Symmetry: C5
Subunit: 103 residues, 5 copies
């Protein structure tokens, strides 16, 4: 069992860590058909999404997806600092796998 | 996969972006039958709605619809400035498809 | 589609708007069997309830009932000003159908 | 239908109102098997629980129990003043049936 | 029925109370498959996790597992002081069984 985001990220193919250590610059969410997703960006231009739930996701993940979005929304609204993000490299924008926050 | 609300909005017919850059002025929610919805207005400005889950909606959208109303509620409470709204303009008041927030 | 709580309220029988323009004075919720409800009051003594889900309700109203209780709790805890309440006046306390909040 | 926690509490057997008029001193939560409950205490030493969801709860009560825990947690965090608690006295600690917050 | 986290913890094998009396230093959440979990740290380097729901858990725990993660997130954001953590000490990182907050 990983003890941190970096180690966890490393257990998957085409994932990479992005160290941001900054609050989220912008938060966007959509209910539009086939575009029920969330996108976040940081003042430096970095952009990430929380993918539309799909077949690429297993059942156990669906609830975690909803949670990530609750997390991103609140982190944004509170300006919580985002330390790191684990993301899949094979999606544009890069899809969020995990997030770490620290003061 | 779009990287911002504008591009996302451009992916649908009958849509448009409303640039607000202002916090929500009022929030109204109804549990009344066939009128389960949320309605927001902007100071001296427009009124927007999150449509009642109708036949027009695909199953994937339901949760996103619930999420959008929660988002509108908290942005209102917290007085978070809304950047832009992507709405369907073949509906009245215009119906919210997506929302971006940035300071 | 109604653009405000007043117009929405008038779309049903046995309803009426109560203008409060004030914060919720007290918030009460119960988990007791057959009394899973919330009751709020205002400084002026006005008392309102969020009815226990029942046969008078249609399925699409179930989630809305839960959302309204979430709304009242946070509104209460943040002392959000409640503008108006559309209620059904054929129940005691008057049963909330909708709520509007404005600064 | 009752109009306050006191009247609501009286509709059931083995219950009693505790008048606290104080913020919560401690909040405890457990995910341990057969002990998925929550415990709160007030500076005067009073201790109350939200029972593990069980056979003694009708279905309609299930969501309400979860709601009650959310309430206590946010009430704790906001130092919200708890006016009264309606509890079942045939349990130790006494089990929360309802809660009223004011002043 | 236990009246505090310590007595509760003592009801199980392989558990222990960690007394922190401190805010959570970092919060990490993952939606990655088979790694849908949360991990927190304290400035003293202490690491804990909320386990991925697994075979070791009974159904009654799934709900408490989600709420626990909800709890860890709001506490971190509010910088609320965590009093104690009841954990199973036969896992690395130590798995959270319960949490208490006071002061
Ligand atoms: O979202 N889509 O994929 C999609 C595809 C095709 C049409 C379409 O518009 C229709 O449905 C939306 C909600 O989806 C709104 O209610 C519109 O006002 C309605 O006319 C939407
Ligand atoms: O919401 N509707 O579509 C609708 C249609 C017809 C009647 C109606 O009122 C009835 O149900 C509501 C709860 O819905 C309240 O319990 C009222 O006190 C009850 O009289 C509501
Ligand atoms: O809620 N009710 O409708 C209801 C009806 C009859 C008895 C009753 O009490 C029983 O169940 C509650 C939870 O409901 C607590 O566990 C009590 O300690 C137990 O005695 C509750
Ligand atoms: O919670 N219980 O009732 C219970 C009963 C018996 C054993 C037990 O511990 C086992 O499961 C938990 C999750 O429950 C943790 O994963 C422990 O590390 C694992 O060994 C837990
Ligand atoms: O999460 N996993 O356990 C897991 C296992 C194997 C592949 C895998 O990646 C695939 O699915 C994820 C969503 O999970 C993303 O959509 C990736 O971009 C896609 O390639 C993910």
């Amino acid at each position: 069992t990983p003890q941190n985001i970096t180690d966890l990220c490393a257990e998957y193919h085409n994932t990479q860590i992005h160290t941001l250590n900054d609050k989220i610059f912008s938060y966007t969410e959509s209910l539009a058909g086939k575009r029920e997703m969330a996108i976040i960006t940081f003042k430096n231009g970095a952009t990430f999404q929380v993918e539309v739930p799909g077949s690429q996701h297993i059942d156990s993940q669906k609830k975690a997806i909803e949670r990530m979005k609750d997390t991103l929304r609140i982190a944004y609204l509170t300006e919580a600092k985002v330390e790191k993000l684990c993301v899949w490299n094979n999606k544009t924008p890069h899809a969020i796998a995990a997030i770490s926050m620290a003061n």
